[PDB]
Design a protein around this ligand. Sequence first.
Ligand SMILES: CO[C@@H]1O[C@H](CO)[C@@H](O[C@@H]2O[C@H](CO)[C@@H](O[C@@H]3O[C@H](CO)[C@@H](O[C@@H]4O[C@H](CO)[C@@H](O)[C@H](O)[C@H]4NC(C)=O)[C@H](O[C@H](C)C(=O)O)[C@H]3NC(C)=O)[C@H](O)[C@H]2NC(C)=O)[C@H](O[C@H](C)C(=O)O)[C@H]1NC(C)=O
Length: 77
Amino acid sequence: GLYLQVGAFANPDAAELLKAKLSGVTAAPVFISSVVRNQQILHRVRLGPIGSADEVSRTQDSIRVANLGQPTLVRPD
Ligand SMILES: CO[C@@H]1O[C@H](CO)[C@@H](O[C@@H]2O[C@H](CO)[C@@H](O[C@@H]3O[C@H](CO)[C@@H](O[C@@H]4O[C@H](CO)[C@@H](O)[C@H](O)[C@H]4NC(C)=O)[C@H](O[C@H](C)C(=O)O)[C@H]3NC(C)=O)[C@H](O)[C@H]2NC(C)=O)[C@H](O[C@H](C)C(=O)O)[C@H]1NC(C)=O
């Protein structure tokens, strides 16, 4: 499965809001992965798993149309 990251935030409310907005533009699962980085909590807003490269492309397009960020492929850890 393929995964996108749409943003990463120190403010968890910003991450939750972006997650909620993304659910309106994609059918793929949207989730927050929070990690410790540089002595702070970083809330990463991600989606997937997406089943194909073509669906990834169209999902990136939909996110840009919605002005929700510049989504990039990531691999989960
Ligand atoms: C190759 O390295 C990887 O590059 C990635 C490049 O995309 C990088 O991901 C990005 O990481 C940056 C931080 O480094 C992250 O930026 C956040 O950007 C948003 C804007 O989209 C900020 O939000 C806005 O802030 C302004 C005021 O500053 C507000 O007025 C505005 O309302 C905010 N917007 C929203 C929607 O709420 C955000 O700052 C707010 C204040 C917050 O933190 O809550 C920035 N955060 C930080 C911590 O700086 C950007 O979103 C993110 N892009 C994507 C697509 O994920 C990778 O770094 C991230 C952190 C990661 O590792 O997961 C790079 N990876 C590594 C390992 O270096």
